[PDB]
Design a protein around this motif. Structure first.
Motif, PDB file in Angstrom:
ATOM      1  N   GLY A 136      -8.198   3.678   0.492  1.00  0.00           N
ATOM      2  CA  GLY A 136      -7.706   4.884   1.142  1.00  0.00           C
ATOM      3  C   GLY A 136      -7.673   4.808   2.659  1.00  0.00           C
ATOM      4  O   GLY A 136      -7.705   5.842   3.314  1.00  0.00           O
ATOM      5  N   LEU A 137      -7.612   3.598   3.224  1.00  0.00           N
ATOM      6  CA  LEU A 137      -7.639   3.411   4.688  1.00  0.00           C
ATOM      7  C   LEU A 137      -6.366   2.787   5.295  1.00  0.00           C
ATOM      8  O   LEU A 137      -6.311   2.586   6.515  1.00  0.00           O
ATOM      9  CB  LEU A 137      -8.892   2.608   5.093  1.00  0.00           C
ATOM     10  CG  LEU A 137     -10.110   3.444   5.508  1.00  0.00           C
ATOM     11  CD1 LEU A 137     -10.767   4.132   4.322  1.00  0.00           C
ATOM     12  CD2 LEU A 137     -11.125   2.575   6.239  1.00  0.00           C
ATOM     13  N   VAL A 138      -5.346   2.526   4.466  1.00  0.00           N
ATOM     14  CA  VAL A 138      -4.103   1.853   4.893  1.00  0.00           C
ATOM     15  C   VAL A 138      -2.900   2.819   5.013  1.00  0.00           C
ATOM     16  O   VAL A 138      -2.410   3.058   6.119  1.00  0.00           O
ATOM     17  CB  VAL A 138      -3.763   0.671   3.959  1.00  0.00           C
ATOM     18  CG1 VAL A 138      -2.476  -0.028   4.396  1.00  0.00           C
ATOM     19  CG2 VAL A 138      -4.921  -0.326   3.922  1.00  0.00           C
ATOM     20  N   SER A 139      -2.409   3.344   3.886  1.00  0.00           N
ATOM     21  CA  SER A 139      -1.262   4.275   3.891  1.00  0.00           C
ATOM     22  C   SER A 139      -1.679   5.760   4.023  1.00  0.00           C
ATOM     23  O   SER A 139      -0.905   6.581   4.544  1.00  0.00           O
ATOM     24  CB  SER A 139      -0.397   4.053   2.644  1.00  0.00           C
ATOM     25  OG  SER A 139      -1.185   4.049   1.463  1.00  0.00           O
ATOM     26  N   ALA A 140      -2.888   6.093   3.577  1.00  0.00           N
ATOM     27  CA  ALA A 140      -3.379   7.484   3.573  1.00  0.00           C
ATOM     28  C   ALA A 140      -3.564   8.126   4.957  1.00  0.00           C
ATOM     29  O   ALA A 140      -3.221   9.298   5.129  1.00  0.00           O
ATOM     30  CB  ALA A 140      -4.665   7.601   2.765  1.00  0.00           C
ATOM     31  N   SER A 155       0.868  -1.172   0.000  1.00  0.00           N
ATOM     32  CA  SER A 155       0.000   0.000   0.000  1.00  0.00           C
ATOM     33  C   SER A 155       0.910   1.229   0.000  1.00  0.00           C
ATOM     34  O   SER A 155       1.901   1.271   0.731  1.00  0.00           O
ATOM     35  CB  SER A 155      -0.905   0.022   1.220  1.00  0.00           C
ATOM     36  OG  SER A 155      -1.648   1.234   1.288  1.00  0.00           O
TER      37      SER A 155
END
Ligand SMILES: *C(=O)[C@@H](NC(=O)/C(=N\O)c1nsc(N)n1)[C@@H]1NC(C(=O)O)=C(CC2=CCN([C@@H]3CCNC3)C2=O)CS1
Ligand SMILES: [Cl-]
Ligand SMILES: [Cl-]
Length: 502
Positions: free
Chosen positions: A477-481, A447
């Motif tokens: 959009g919930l892991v690295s962001a 990610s």
């Protein structure tokens, strides 16, 4: 019988600091005990108290001395305090001596181990900055002339021929405050997402400075035993990965620079797949027909960017990616630093044109990706990278035209802020801009988020890489962001950057 001999005077190795003078690597005096076997062999009745005092079995110590009975030098134990290293001397054993030596201590430990690296038992650079800048840090040893008796014992210090010269202080580009923040949040992110490893790089877009560079897993450089090879890797510089969709803003830059494309232009991506001979380009979401250029980046449509790539030609895209430094040597000279690979062709085929455009079959480092985003953020001008504090900023190279750079910046702000975008990358109080990526490895994924802020007057670029998170469905959009959001928020505050989303 007895000889006049020349010997070294060790040099004080130079202090490494962060950009604001916080100590990162310090040469600290430690007491070392050594012995002269030829002298020890005349006082065998002392050996057991000497062994006992050193925590050594009496027999094994005795064997060691008997075997070395014609040598003139061995270490007993190194790295003691003055109180410990005089406690043995109080015994007054013949041929036993104490010296103050210099060895490295790393006050921030694991937090900056990958960047700073370490010295070996002999105090010479072995990893990271310690190795890279060893000549700067080491100085030059001095030289003394010395009369030694029959046993090798120094009876006269006859004359100093050459004084020692200390090493030079080195101030890194790293800001320890940002480094701590990045370190903590990357660690917390791996736990929450169940990930194997990761990297985080923060760069100053105006100066080329690497303000933070952290990886998980990491290690304590002050306590190097049971040390895994994997934990020692500065993954941000020595691991290569496919950047995937994070290169799409560079494909878009080529598109806008061609004269053939504007943000409001439409591409038909129905039915969410596109065949090129045997290969089939496949979108993550496949309920679209017409998308505008911003929508292509929001949806991260591979089909959309591929069709743009056919229209403008792979050559324009390759050139943007080359110019921003993807797959190109950074010139930092970090040990084991990888260059990666931006493939080139004399004549680009259709399949390779598409895959180039969405970052498939390309190989980069996290530092390269951050540097490329810094160029984009700095209105298209690339400032050369630095791991040391930059007081006088070198001239940048204009690699994307300022207007094209500003248009893409605006599109990436919409990627973060617009309906259906990467809302978790939003930075409270600021406008931020960036692009997500998800890369297959060959079930197993990386990610990625790359971005910059403040969107309207960019100061900081950032890349977050999370290696193999444990989420079944879409990363969405919930892991690295969210890691970008938290670390960017903190970095902007610590650097007193005015909020632009009041
Ligand atoms: C760009 O990043 C695109 N990703 C790709 O096409 C890659 N595989 O999916 C890829 N590029 S290079 C390489 N080696 N692989 C698009 N972007 C995104 C995104 O915006 O994050 C995608 C989403 C996505 C793919 C897989 N996802 C989950 C992983 C765990 N289970 C599904 C996911 O969210 C793909 S298209
Ligand atoms: Cl779908
Ligand atoms: Cl994400």
């Amino acid at each position: 019988a007895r000889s006049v001999r020349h010997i070294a005077i060790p040099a004080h190795r130079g202090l490494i600091t962060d950009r604001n003078g916080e100590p990162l690597a310090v040469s600290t005096p430690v007491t070392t005990l050594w012995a002269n076997p030829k002298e020890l062999m005349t006082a065998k009745e002392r050996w057991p108290q000497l062994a006992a005092a050193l925590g050594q079995d009496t027999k094994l110590f005795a064997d060691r001395i008997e075997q070395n009975a014609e040598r003139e030098f061995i270490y007993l134990v190194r790295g003691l305090t003055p109180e410990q290293g005089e406690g043995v001397i109080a015994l007054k054993v013949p041929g036993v001596y104490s010296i103050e030596e210099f060895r490295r201590f790393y006050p921030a430990g694991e937090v900056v181990a990958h960047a700073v690296g370490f010295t070996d038992v002999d105090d010479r650079g072995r990893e990271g900055i310690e190795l890279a800048f060893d000549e700067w840090l080491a100085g030059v040893p001095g030289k003394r002339q010395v009369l030694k008796d029959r046993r090798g014992r120094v009876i006269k210090d006859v004359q100093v021929t050459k004084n020692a010269k200390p090493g030079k202080t080195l101030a890194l580009s790293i800001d320890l405050r940002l480094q701590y923040l990045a370190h903590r949040e990357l660690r917390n992110a791996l736990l929450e997402n169940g990930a194997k490893a990761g990297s985080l790089v923060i760069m100053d877009v105006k100066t080329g400075e690497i303000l933070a560079m952290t990886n998980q897993p990491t290690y304590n450089p002050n306590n190097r035993r049971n040390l895994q090879p994997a934990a020692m890797r500065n993954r941000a510089m020595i691991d290569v990965f496919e950047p995937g969709s994070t290169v799409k803003p560079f494909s878009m830059s080529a598109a806008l620079a061609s004269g053939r494309w504007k943000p409001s232009d439409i591409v038909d991506v129905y039915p969410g797949t596109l065949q090129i001979g045997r290969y089939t380009i496949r979108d993550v979401s496949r309920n679209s027909r017409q998308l505008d250029l911003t929508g292509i980046l929001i949806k991260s449509s591979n089909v959309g960017i591929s069709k743009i790539a056919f229209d403008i030609g792979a050559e324009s895209i390759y050139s943007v990616m080359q110019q921003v430094g993807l797959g190109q040597d950074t010139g930092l000279g970090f040990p084991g630093e990888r260059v990666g690979n931006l493939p080139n062709h004399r004549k680009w085929p259709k399949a390779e044109t598409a895959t180039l455009a969405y970052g498939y079959g390309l190989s980069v480092t996290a530092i390269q990706l951050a540097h490329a985003y810094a160029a984009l953020a700095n209105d298209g001008k690339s400032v050369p990278l630095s791991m040391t504090r930059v007081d006088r900023v070198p001239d940048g190279v204009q690699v994307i035209s300022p207007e094209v750079a500003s248009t893409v910046q605006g599109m990436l702000q919409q990627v973060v802020e617009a309906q259906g975008g990467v809302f978790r990358a939003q930075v409270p109080g600021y406008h931020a801009a960036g692009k997500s990526g998800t890369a297959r490895k060959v079930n197993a994924y990386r990610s990625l988020f790359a971005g910059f802020a403040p969107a309207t007057d960019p100061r900081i670029a950032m890349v977050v890489v999370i290696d193999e998170p444990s989420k079944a469905g879409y990363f969405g959009g919930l892991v690295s962001a969210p890691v970008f959001s938290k670390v960017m928020a903190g970095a902007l505050r610590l650097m007193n950057v005015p909020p632009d989303n009041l």
